[model samples]
Target: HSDLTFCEIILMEMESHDAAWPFLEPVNPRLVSGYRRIIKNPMDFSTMRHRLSRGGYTSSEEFAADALLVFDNCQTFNEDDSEVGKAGHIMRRFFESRWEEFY
Candidate 1:
């Protein structure tokens, strides 16, 4: 439990979202590259690590918001509710904002 990592959190989110189980279509290079950069950024990593270390298991939505925050390059990262439902809502907004970027 203590050894769990953020990668696992993402896996859970993917499973929960059932995101085609493995993106079949071409992924937006920007999204892929941007997300990689986000994780690589020391500040972002620190924030993610802190969230993971806070104890208890995180929900799929929580993981989504975190990933979406990086994906959207939003200044806000904190999850006000940190609940699965809220995470879904935030993710939807993020997706809407980036829909064009995907195309």
Candidate 2:
């Protein structure tokens, strides 16, 4: 988590839960593959839930806001359709729900 942007953390966080697991339409294979790659390795995020929770966050609301804000400001690639569509919305809610429990 050292110096990783909120979006980077969010993306990693999403990977941990497989939140963006479904939709493939406007998807980035690299992003998905990268997430899968991280998930495949246990060392990647074993303590993320506890680590993220220790800060006493109520939910991913603060996390989401920071992630989105960073994403908005960056000159990102694969900007085709990663707008978190319907499926993403569903997953985001689910991710947020689980994230809330830790704190």
Candidate 3:
């Protein structure tokens, strides 16, 4: 199946949940929309799950960490360089706060 992996599902869910009730405040629509744009690739999760499973991760935290790595490495608009505006900071904060749900 080409469905989202567990990690991708977690991210997608987080975006949805955070939009309604966020840690600090709801992220701007730019951040939300940008993140959605980047993560819409099904192949990313396909590879992410494969890598996570291969790494022998056993918990949601591990998934979160790995996902952070993926974001840090793959996300073009993250942190230092943001092509998607302030979404990087917002997403980073959201990911850290909601790491527990990302399994």
Candidate 4:
């Protein structure tokens, strides 16, 4: 199967998750202090979707890197046990579980 096709499927799976709401859009710089300075290369589902549709990533590996960045940014910014933090962990686990099978 084509890598772009598979990556598109992966993006849909991530977007469909119940806990995916917080990560669906870009984190607003004004809403959170130090977010821009800290997370230099911010990644969100919307941006990823745009990138995929615009032919930004050539392979699933590149797409997956951007996908994981959403979680990583979450982990970096939120409290470890906070609601968003918990969701990040859960979502990462979900992505990794299915992605491992692909690799």
Model 3's lDDT to the true fold?
Answer: 0.48
List, residue by residue over 11-93, the lDDT tens digit for candidate 3.
56554643323222323447555755554332233354465557555665566665565445334534455442254455566
Which residue pairs clash within candidate 1?
none
User: How close is every model to the real structure, measured as TM-score?
Assistant: 0.30, 0.29, 0.38, 0.91
In Å, residue 77's CA in model 3 sits off its true spot by 7.6
- Per-residue lDDT for 1-103 in model 4, tens only? 4777777777899899998988899989999889998887898999999998899897788888998888888998888799988889888998998787677
Clashes of each: 0, 0, 0, 0
List the pairs of residues colliding in candidate 4. none
Candidate 1 segments exceeding 4 Å error: 1-43, 74-103
- The reply for model 4, stretches above 4 Å from the true place, is none
> Highest TM-score, which number?
4
Candidate 4 lowest-lDDT run of ten: 1-10
Best by lDDT: 4
TM-score of 1: 0.30
Better of 3 and 4 by lDDT: 4
